[PDB]
Each structure stands twice: as C-alpha cells, then as structure tokens.
C-alpha cells in the first residue's frame, strides 16, 4: 500500500556472484532495492525504506529509514561478499528496526531478498514467524535462491502469519533463471499487496 | 570446448577417478560456480601428485577468474607449483596473476563495490619468495622475505591462510641452513595457525 | 544504405554513444570529489587552528626548587610555573626559551632560541655582490684584507704554530667611493661565510 | 592496527556522565548501555576527555542479537568536533557489570571508525568494589601456544 | 561510433549486431545506479564544505589586531608515531599529545610575542620572517596577510 | 502577584560545574557560551540536569552568536536517546571580567527572558578556579519597567537574605540594582558520592 515503512534485508552470498542473471546476481539486486524504493515513494512520499545487510557473520544496520535512496545505494556499495545472511537473526533484527523510527503511523513490512539454500533450524523460525502475526507485521519473503536446490521450509512460515491484519505477509516466487530479477520483484505486488481483514 | 581438453585428463586417470571430471563440467554448464569450487576441492586432496592436477588447473585459470572465488584460485596456484619440477614456469605463472589483478582491481572494486585483490598479492609474493629457497637462491630468497615480513605487519588483520604460507617459507630457510634455533619459535608459530 | 536493417542500427550506434559518455561521466565526477576534498581538507585544517589557542613564551631564570621554577615571562615580570612531565629538569637550562601556558602557567616543552624579526634583513640583503675581485690595482690591500678574516676562518691551526691570539677586529676606512662597501659585499659572496 | 594504549587516564567526568546516561534511558534488569568515547590517541595515555549516548537495544532472548544506529555515530561526532576539534572516536563504552564475548563482534564494527584499536571500557554502574569502578580492555589478535589459531 | 554500424555489416553478421544492443542496455543500467550514488556524494560534501568555512568567516571580519611576524622556526609535520617535533621531550608515544605542527611566532603592538600554532590556510609562501600580518584579537591565531606598513606622511607622499 | 515570584536557587549538578569549566577552560583567554538544560519545579528550584556548548564565534559572545541549527540539532540528538528536557538558561564565560552581566550579555538575557521567564545566565571564570575555590555566579534579568513598579521587594521575599556580592563601584551597581543574584548549592546522589 502506502503509509509503510520497509525494512530490506539483503542476502550476501557467494550463491550471488554465479551467473544466474546478467552481469551477476548481486548487480542484478543492486536495480531491485532502487525499484523498489522508488515504487514506494511515488505513490505517497510519507513512506522510507531503509536497508539492513546480513554483511559480516552477524547483520548490521547500513541505513535506517530515509526518502533519500542515494543513501540507501551508498550503503550497498559499502558491503562484505562472503557473509553469510542468518535467517533467525535477520528477523530479530528488522522487528528492532521497525520499532526504531521517528513515526508510528506507517504500516510493518519486510522485504526479505533469499539468494542462499535456506539450512536454519525450522522448528525455530515456526515461533519468530507467530511472534510477528502479534506484532501486526508482515513479511514479503522473494524466493529464487530456495527452489533452485532445496526443500521449501519459508512456505509454511508464510501461512502461520496470516490471520486478519492491516499487513499481512505474501510469497513472492522469483524465477532463478535469467528473465531479469529486476523486473519479475516489479511485476509481482509490492505496492498493491493487501491486508486479509 | 572444455569437454574435449577434460577427455584426456578422463582417459589417462582411473575408472573410479572418472566420474569426479563430469561434475565438475555439469556445474560449468547450469553455471553455479560455487558449487564448482566445492567440487574442484577434492580431486586435490587425494592426488595433487599427479600431473594431471596441474593440467586440470592451467585450463581452469583461463576460463574462471571472476567467475569461481579468486581465493579458491590462488590457493590452487600454491598447490600447483609444489608439483611442478619446473622453477622457470613457476616465475611464468606467479607474474602472469599478479599483473592481472593490478589491472582487474581498477574496474572490480568500483563496479561490485568490494573484493581486495592485495589478499591475492600475498599471497603470490609468498610461493616467489617459496620458488627461490628450492632454488637454493638464499640471498635473493631472504632479502624478498625481510620485504614481505614488513608488509604483512602493515595489513591490520591477516587472514589465517596468508601467514601461515609465510610460515612455511620461514621454516624452509632455517633448516637449509641448520640454525636449530631460528627453525624452533617459527615451527611453534606454523604448527599453530595451521 | 546498405541494408534497410541498417534503420535499426542508427539506434544502435545511438546507445554506444551514450555507454561510452557515462564511462566518462564516472571518471569525470571522480575528479570533481578529488577537487572538493582538497578544498574541504583546506578548510579543516583551518577548524583545527582556530581551537587552539596561544601560548606566551618565558626563560628560564632561576632553579627555584625540584618543580617550581622563576622564569621572566615576554610580558615582562617574573612568574613562578610548574613542570608537565613532557619536559624533564635535565632539559631545562638557564637561558631556554621556554613555552609557558596562558591559564595554566606551565612549561609544556622547550623552545629554541628568540631571533629579532630586524636581524632576518641583514642576513638577506648581501646583494651587489661580485667575485673574489672588486675593484683592481688594490689586490694588494683585498690580500690583506683575508689575512685577518680568511685566514683564521679556514685554520686556526696556522695561529695556533705563531701562539699569537687569532687575528680579529678591522677598521676600513678612506677617502668615499674606493669600494669599502664593495669588498665588505665581496667577502661575505666568495667566502660564503655568516 | 597497533597497541599504544598501556596507559588509559580517564576524566572523572566521563565516569559521572555515563551513570547519567544509563538511568535516563533507565536500562535495568540486565539491559545494556553503548556510547562513544571521545578523545585522544596515538599517545601511549589514552585521554578520554568526553562521552556521548548512542542509542543502542540490547536484547533480553540472546545477546548476540542488537540493534544499533549507525547513521546516529557521525552526526554526534561532527557537532563534537565544533566544539573542540581534538575529539574523535577511541571505542565505546559498556555499562559493564561484566565482559562479555558478544562485545567482541561489537567492538569489529566500531574499528572501522577508528584510526586506533578501539577502547572497551567497562563502566560499572554498580560501584561494586572499594577501587576502581573502571576494567578496561582492547580487542587484541593473538595466536597462541596451544594450537589455537587467529584468536579475538 | 566504431561499433554498430555499416563498419559492422561488412565484419560481422547483424543479428549478432541485435544482441548486442540488448548488452549495451545491460551494462548502461549498471553505469546510472553508479552516476547517481556519484552525486549524491558530492550533495553531501558540499555542504561539509559551507559548515567549515562559514565558522572562518566569523573571525575573518572586524576587528582584529595587526602585528607582525618574528620568525617562522616551524615543527615537524603530523604524520609520525613518536612526537613531531623539532625539539626533544620527555616520554614516548606522541603525535597530538603535547606535539604541535608548524610554527610562527608573532610579535604583537600590545608589545608581547605569542607562540601560536599558525593556520593551515596561511602558508609558508605567505610568512616571510618580517611578514605584516593580521592576527585574531579574540584568540591569537594569524588570521590574514596584509600589505608592510606606511607612516601617515609617506602615504602624504604619494 | 499570586506566586513566589522570586529567582530560582540554581542547583547544578555534579556533571554539569566540570563540564562548563572544562569548556570554558579550553577557549581561555576568548569567550566561551553554551546552553544550560535541566527542568523546572517549584517556583525557585531549578535543578540543571546537563550542559551543551554552543561553537565559537570570531566575536564571541553575541545575540547573534546563537545559530538555532545548532542549538536544534544537537537538541534532536539527545531527544533520541531520551536525556533531553528543556533550555532553562544559558552559560558564558567572563574571564577578563569578575562575575557580572557585561553590557551585551544583559540584551542576550532579555532575548532569552522572552522565550521562557526563568532563564538563568551563569557567569563561570574557568580562570579564578585556579585557586582551591571555584567562582561562578548566577543572575536573572529584572526589567527596566520592573523597577519602575518597585517590585524588587518581590523577589527577595521567602529566601534566607542571602546574597552574594563582587567587587565595588561599577560591579556591584549592575548586581543589585539591576539582576537579582541567587546563591548556587551543589546536587548530588550517594551513587555519584
Ligand atoms: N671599484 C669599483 N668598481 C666598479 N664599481 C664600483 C667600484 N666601487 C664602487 N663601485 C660602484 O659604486 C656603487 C656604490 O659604492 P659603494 O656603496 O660600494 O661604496 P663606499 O666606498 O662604502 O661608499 P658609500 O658608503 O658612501 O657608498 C657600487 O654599487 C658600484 O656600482
Ligand atoms: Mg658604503
């Protein structure tokens, strides 16, 4: 919708420097933060993006929220390669980041980018996926780095969330061969993405 | 293409050793070049001894740089070099990476916004300064460590593997000449970071 | 044209135009952020000047005690400072210049020697000069003149076999415009002493 | 980068504020408090002259798990360096009561501001002991006789 | 242009032509996210450049004394790990500690000399040892160059 | 009329006395200026929390030394971490002078009165406090009109009678005559202790 405020989370892999889309797949998710954050902005400009990194071995904060999304690319120049994203922390983190901001008045939402096989213990991504539906937030999780060889566990977090709410979590399927990942994150909702109330 | 260089490596090796070449060509193919780097890991730990290791190798430097880690690369070229007899060649190769990345890194780093090129530099300087101990070189080989132990000093986090190669060079000096003593405390150092 | 396809590629040539402009548009704005840097370091080192603050230079008098010490101050009238433990007793001498805080009141660190701002003048005006020779026909008396400066500039050792005192103190004087100022110019150039 | 830190002075100052700080974001019940250290280095006495509250949640499920501002760093540092222009980033401060191992992925992060190693310094706020309230500490890389390698 | 073109319909084949223009669009993308991070850095640098000077410009007007120049006796330049001084202290580990950079040393017409740290704006090529200078009533730093003095009757002169 | 109507007893805390003399200390001989931040109750007992020192100036102390974007966002900083409250006077630095309002200071003052009526202006010599004794002294503004309403019996009702003093002649008649003084008492917790 609009009146939303989104937290990135970007996978840094060696998953992402294959070549799975032109020039590389990391490049190809550089295009897609900015889409995303220019869809948001356009239509209402009361809505800020800002990015965490699973950069590092544990993630750390590049920017917080901001209109600006020359800050947002300034950061992602900024980053490690061979991290390595941790689901269960990355959740952790962006429900923190969410409760830190200068207004209350804008709407949950994570977009989290998966590029790696997914090999974090289900059973405890069962209970943050249930602590997020009491918090009112929602969760956008674009898989295209889970199908290519691997079971599908995000699948089922997805469901847990879904209970009548202002925001409410979506699954987004990304083809992992080339057909531009830039462009398949903007066909799919991200700006037309609905509640279940 | 690859295939066909592949075929006589494939021929030459055993039966059971043929299997390991075809995966490496199916990752090629889907172009998953992490799962390559997995896969090229371990034909070298069983048979580094052979010479169709450092074939294996030569063909993989020209067709992957950017595309499997640059470290995964360089590691290899340590390898390599143990297997060849060859001391001339040896030189040939150290220099013909080491001039690569001065150029690459000009383009690499703006472009990705990150990946040093100077971790890679180490560790080629260390297999040259390698290359004149088993020459028997020993005023060339200590004058380029005095040089390299100051620059290692300089880089304010090593990684393991770069110090731990600096350490085998040292301890391949001090043997040579029978100091007993220098050999010990570098060794305690090796044995350590391993 | 040639072809009827060649439509498409006016388009084309178009694009290449516009890829090989941003390549220097890069390069271009990484000379523009260089050019702000230096003005923005010129303007740094400023804020960092004008933080800090004077300080009002002494002598050291007269030892007092082990950590109180008189100096005269540049004001004028004597002060009794402490010592920070920049300074030691041991570099402190009568005589030194010595720094002095202006709300503290302590030697910091010592200073050479107070030079007039007149004296620099006199130091850097020898112009007018010309070689060993002056005027001539009064070589005889220029010959003379080096048997008291000269001579006792380059070996004191010659003085030394005499047992005479070494030569020192001259008078010139004469009828006006015979070229005492000339060879006064002369043998401050061909010696090149201070 | 380099130990040149055998001596930390510290400002009694410093010790006052940061008591000031940790009650006036009122952090109890073993919840944690980070600020920048201001001052002094490249002197073998590390001066801490000055000290500024960074905000800084610290979980109660794991405590390998924070948030902190970034962004929040640098805009404290540059209305500081009007003020005197001798005060740059030395490390961060703990609100203690005791070190822990989780400060040292902390203390990776705060090296990239840093031209020095950076400082941990534990101030207890719990005065516990007749001496000093402060331990302080810095994250040195050491190999080590055992056979443990590129120890933090 | 030296690709493209009927250059290229004589060397290579047209649809390979097609193919590449569909690249050029490619790394074109890269070259526009690299633009815009590129200005936005230089929107973030000017304005670290009007903070700094505005500051200068409060000390730069009226009024402020006129003095002038003992000596310049300088001190080594920052950039070392032990001191950077000219003149040998006590203890080790210094380079802002009690360490200072160049140096000036003004004579005032308050008749007193102040050892002051000279402004990294002003230079050496500024500074002659009897240079005329302005210095900062307020707080003693040379704040400009101003041309030698000239008694009221030698300007009567002219 | 209706109130105590008289000037706040100026409790400073144990932070804020060593962090105005640091900053004052530092910019000697120049004067040196800075916010004072701390809360209000009662009618007469300020207690000022923490300070902020406002940048130099090549004029020094000014009305016009006061730039709103530095006293705002350095304001917006300490609002993030919940350690802000509300600007209940003002410090600066006379260190060529004894304690008193100089001439420029007292139309600063009278800005700052308009803004919120408590304001304080605290005079610190960072120079005089190279003795054993700290001397810092405390003066609020009362208005020209003011005297004219003969109101200064006002405000020296409900206090101990107490007052402090600074020199003779010049000094002494701004003290008096035209700012109230009001002693400085020094606040602290046995955790601090
Ligand atoms: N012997 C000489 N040959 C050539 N030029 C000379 C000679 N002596 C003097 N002059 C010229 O005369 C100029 C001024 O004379 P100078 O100042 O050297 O002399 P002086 O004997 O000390 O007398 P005063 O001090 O009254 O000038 C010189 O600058 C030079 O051009
Ligand atoms: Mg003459």
């Not at chain 5, 390979?16 to 640098?45: P, Y």
């Not at chain 5, 000219?86 to 009690?98: K, P, Y």
Request: aromatic share 8%.
């Amino acid at each position: 919708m609009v009146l939303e405020a989104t937290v990135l989370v970007i996978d840094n892999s060696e998953y992402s420097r294959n070549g799975d889309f032109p020039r590389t797949r990391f490049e190809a998710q550089i295009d897609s933060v900015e889409f995303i954050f220019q869809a948001k902005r356009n239509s209402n400009p009361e809505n800020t993006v800002g990015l965490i990194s699973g950069a590092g071995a544990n993630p750390r904060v590049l920017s917080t929220f901001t209109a600006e999304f020359g800050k947002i690319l300034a950061g992602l120049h900024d980053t490690q390669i061979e991290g390595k994203l941790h689901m269960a922390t990355a959740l952790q983190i962006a429900q923190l980041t969410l409760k830190h901001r200068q207004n209350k008045v804008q709407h949950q939402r994570i977009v989290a980018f998966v590029c790696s096989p997914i090999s974090d213990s289900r059973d405890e991504l069962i209970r943050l996926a249930k602590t997020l539906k009491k918090n009112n937030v929602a969760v956008d999780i674009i898989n295209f780095g889970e199908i290519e060889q691997n079971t599908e566990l995000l699948d089922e977090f997805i469901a847990a969330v879904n209970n009548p709410q202002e925001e409410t979590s979506h699954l987004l399927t990304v083809t992992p061969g080339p057909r531009l990942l830039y462009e398949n994150i903007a066909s799919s909702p991200i700006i037309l993405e609905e509640g279940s109330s | 293409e690859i295939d066909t260089i592949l075929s006589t490596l494939r021929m030459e090796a055993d039966p059971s050793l043929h299997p390991l070449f075809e995966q490496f060509e199916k990752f090629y193919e889907e172009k998953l070049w992490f799962q390559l780097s997995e896969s090229l890991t371990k034909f070298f730990d069983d048979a580094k001894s052979t010479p169709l290791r450092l074939r294996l190798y030569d063909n993989f430097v020209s067709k992957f740089y950017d595309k499997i880690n640059q470290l995964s690369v360089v590691k290899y070229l340590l390898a390599s070099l143990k297997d060849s007899k060859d001391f001339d060649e040896s030189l040939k190769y150290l220099d013909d990476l080491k001039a690569q990345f001065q150029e690459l890194d000009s383009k690499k780093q703006r472009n990705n916004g990150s990946k040093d090129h100077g971790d890679g530099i180490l560790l080629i300087d260390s297999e040259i300064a390698r290359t004149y101990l088993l020459k028997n070189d020993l005023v060339k080989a200590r004058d380029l460590l005095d040089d390299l132990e100051k620059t290692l000093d300089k880089k304010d986090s090593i990684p393991l593997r770069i110090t731990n190669s600096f350490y085998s060079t040292n301890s391949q000096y001090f043997k040579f000449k029978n100091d007993f003593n220098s050999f010990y405390y570098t060794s305690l150092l090796y044995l350590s970071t391993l | 044209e040639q072809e009827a396809h060649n439509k498409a590629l006016n388009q084309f040539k178009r694009k290449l135009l516009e890829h090989r402009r941003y390549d220097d548009q890069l390069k271009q704005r990484r000379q523009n952020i260089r050019d702000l840097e230096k003005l923005y370091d010129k303007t740094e080192n400023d804020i960092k000047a004008l933080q800090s603050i004077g300080q009002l230079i002494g002598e050291v008098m007269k030892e007092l005690s082990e950590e109180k010490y008189i100096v005269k101050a540049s004001s004028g009238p004597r002060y009794i400072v402490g010592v920070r433990n920049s300074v030691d007793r041991s570099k402190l001498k009568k005589g030194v210049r010595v720094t002095l805080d202006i709300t503290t009141l302590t030697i910091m660190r010592i200073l050479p020697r107070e030079t007039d701002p007149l004296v620099y003048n006199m130091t850097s005006f020898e112009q007018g000069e010309i070689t060993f020779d002056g005027i001539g026909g009064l070589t005889e008396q220029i010959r003379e003149l080096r048997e008291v400066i000269e001579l006792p500039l380059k070996n004191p050792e010659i003085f030394q076999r005499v047992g005479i005192k070494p030569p020192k103190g001259v008078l010139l004087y004469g009828p006006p415009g015979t070229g005492k100022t000339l060879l006064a110019k002369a043998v401050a150039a061909t010696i090149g002493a201070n | 980068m380099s130990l040149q830190h055998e001596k930390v002075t510290i400002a009694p100052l410093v010790l006052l504020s940061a008591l000031d700080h940790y009650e006036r974001t009122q952090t109890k019940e073993n919840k944690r408090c980070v600020g920048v250290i201001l001052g002094d280095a490249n002197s073998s006495t590390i001066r801490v002259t000055n000290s500024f509250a960074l905000p800084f949640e610290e979980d109660e499920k794991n405590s390998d798990v924070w948030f902190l501002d970034h962004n929040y760093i640098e805009n404290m540092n540059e209305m500081c360096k009007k003020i005197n222009a001798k005060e740059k980033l030395i490390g961060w401060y703990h609100s203690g009561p005791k070190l822990r191992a989780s400060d040292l992925k902390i203390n990776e992060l705060f090296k990239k501001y840093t031209q020095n190693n950076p400082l941990l310094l534990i101030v207890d706020v719990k005065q516990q002991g007749v001496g000093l309230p402060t331990d302080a500490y810095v994250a040195i890389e050491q190999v080590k006789d055992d056979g443990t390698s590129t120890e933090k | 242009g030296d690709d493209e073109l009927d250059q290229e319909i004589l060397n290579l084949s047209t649809q390979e032509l097609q193919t590449r223009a569909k690249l050029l669009d490619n790394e074109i993308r890269i070259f526009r996210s690299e633009l815009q991070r590129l200005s936005h850095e230089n929107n973030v640098m000017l304005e670290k450049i009007k903070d700094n000077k505005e500051k200068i410009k409060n000390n730069r007007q009226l009024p402020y004394l006129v003095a002038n120049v003992v000596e310049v006796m300088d001190m080594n330049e920052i950039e070392d790990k032990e001191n950077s001084e000219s003149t040998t202290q006590g203890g080790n580990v210094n380079l802002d500690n009690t360490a200072v950079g160049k140096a000036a040393v003004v004579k005032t017409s308050s008749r007193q000399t102040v050892f002051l740290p000279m402004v990294g704006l002003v230079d050496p090529d500024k500074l002659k040892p009897n240079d005329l200078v302005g210095v900062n009533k307020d707080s003693y730093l040379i704040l400009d160059t101003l041309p030698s003095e000239f008694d009221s009757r030698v300007k009567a002169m002219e | 009329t209706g109130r105590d109507d008289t000037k706040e007893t100026v409790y400073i805390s144990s932070i804020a006395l060593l962090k105005m003399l640091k900053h004052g200390r530092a910019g000697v001989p120049m004067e040196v200026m800075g916010l004072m931040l701390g809360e209000f109750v009662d009618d007469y007992t300020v207690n000022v929390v923490d300070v902020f020192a406002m940048p130099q100036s090549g004029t020094g102390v000014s009305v016009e030394a006061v730039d709103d974007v530095f006293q705002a966002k350095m304001m917006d900083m300490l609002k993030q971490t919940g350690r802000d409250q509300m600007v209940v006077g003002w410090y600066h630095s006379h260190p060529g002078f004894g304690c008193w309002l100089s001439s420029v200071d007292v139309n600063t003052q009278k800005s700052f009165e308009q803004l919120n009526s408590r304001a304080v202006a605290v005079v610190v010599d960072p120079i005089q406090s190279v003795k054993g004794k700290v001397v810092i002294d405390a003066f609020r503004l009362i208005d020209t009109g003011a005297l004219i309403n003969n109101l200064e019996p006002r405000q020296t009702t409900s206090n101990t009678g107490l007052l402090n003093k600074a020199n003779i002649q010049a000094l002494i008649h701004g003290l008096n005559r035209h700012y109230y003084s009001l002693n400085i008492d020094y606040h602290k917790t046995a955790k601090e202790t």
